[PDB]
């Protein structure tokens, strides 16, 4: 089983530098090229560069030479990428991938990506508010997640045991503060006869918030 684990979210201020990792397992780390891709909303996928863990030979995209730095440590099967002189345009999600050969000739295994936010705004834990109907055969509930920074934030209901009829909306930035929502539709025969809880995780601030939705009035 081949796996590529990348490091978590990172918040850096303009002009500073960041360094993310890509830990590989399930194969001989030194025999394959590792690639890095940039993903910025409204810009599609962009090729940064590549490295051969075996001898650390590299090749960078003309556009990224002097912006990105690739390195590797074979004793831990971990590849790293460094970004310096950060600007706003550097905010995006970065992935790493393995170039295969033999059975296939392409990038077959990818990492889960790493989010990078370049801003001088302060970090703020999310405020999670329950949404219960005021006053059918199916009921819709929700959770309002306001005032957090930076993104992202993950949401689940009943810790995941509840996945059907869920709608989690994209986070919108409004003056250094994000906002998102999430609805969930369930049978009237299960609420409030049973419990429904939205779980909100904000890794960027190392916090977790749970909110039980209970009938109003």
């Amino acid at each position: 089983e081949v796996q590529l684990q990348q490091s978590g979210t990172v918040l850096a201020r303009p002009g500073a530098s960041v360094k993310m990792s890509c830990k590989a397992s399930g194969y001989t780390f030194t025999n394959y090229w590792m690639h890095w891709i940039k993903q910025r909303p409204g810009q599609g996928l962009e090729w940064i560069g590549t490295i051969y863990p075996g001898n650390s030979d590299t090749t960078y995209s003309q556009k990224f030479k002097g912006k990105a730095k690739l390195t590797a440590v074979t004793s831990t099967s971990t590849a790293y990428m460094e970004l310096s002189s950060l600007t706003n345009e550097d905010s995006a999600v970065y992935y790493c991938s393995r170039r295969n050969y033999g059975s296939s000739y392409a990038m077959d295994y990818w990492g889960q990506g790493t989010s990078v936010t370049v801003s001088s705004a302060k970090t703020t834990p999310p405020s999670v508010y329950p949404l219960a109907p005021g006053s059918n055969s199916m009921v819709t509930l929700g959770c309002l997640v306001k005032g957090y920074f930076p993104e992202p934030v993950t949401v689940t209901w009943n810790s995941g045991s509840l996945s059907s009829g869920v709608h989690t909306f994209p986070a919108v930035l409004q003056s250094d503060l994000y906002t998102l929502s999430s609805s969930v539709t369930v049978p009237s025969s299960t609420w409030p006869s049973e419990t429904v809880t939205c779980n909100v995780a904000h890794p960027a601030s190392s916090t977790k918030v749970d909110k039980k939705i209970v009938p109003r009035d």
């Binding site: 996928l45 296939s104 109003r216």
Partner: protein, 215 residues
Amino acid sequence: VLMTQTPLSLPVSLGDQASISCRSSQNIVHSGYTYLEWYLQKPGQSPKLLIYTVSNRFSGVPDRFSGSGSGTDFTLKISRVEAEDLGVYYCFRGSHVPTFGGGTKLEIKRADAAPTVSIFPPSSEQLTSGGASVVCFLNNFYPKDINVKWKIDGSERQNGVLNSWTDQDSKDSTYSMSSTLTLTKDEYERHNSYTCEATHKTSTSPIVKSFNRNE
């Protein structure tokens, strides 16, 4: 040497075929071996391999996908599109200066559907902090074009609204929207009726859901 994809957006009904083009400004074809691949990235997931070396299909990939091409033009075909095929497709050159095409956003054409509207008053916890936000969900509707009009005691409101749209549903190919009207606790206390109105192509009469702060 850059990769030109076409089209930028590609609407296609269910059961229909779809064709995406990719043109390498300069030959990269040694028919030997030609390193042209197609990758897919669905919202919330990492990109994934579909086809490598022009026509070779990757494991666990439906046979509805196929690649071909010669010289400077390569093509990706999707025979009989299905709800789960939506996302962004990218062609990639693996040889000299690996480069990504601009990508193509595949979207599904389907029957019209009216939105399910639900409205919710501010939570008590938010009220305590001195704020008051009114949330309104308009879920599983089609087409995507839609408008939300807020009403405070009958009169329209326009300043202080925040809207967000989910990506097309990968099961029923519908869209959903969330609209939040944020007011100060004082501003919210000076009024009683709050209405969330939705005007959609499935009617000339808007769908309305509201409540009174006096229950």
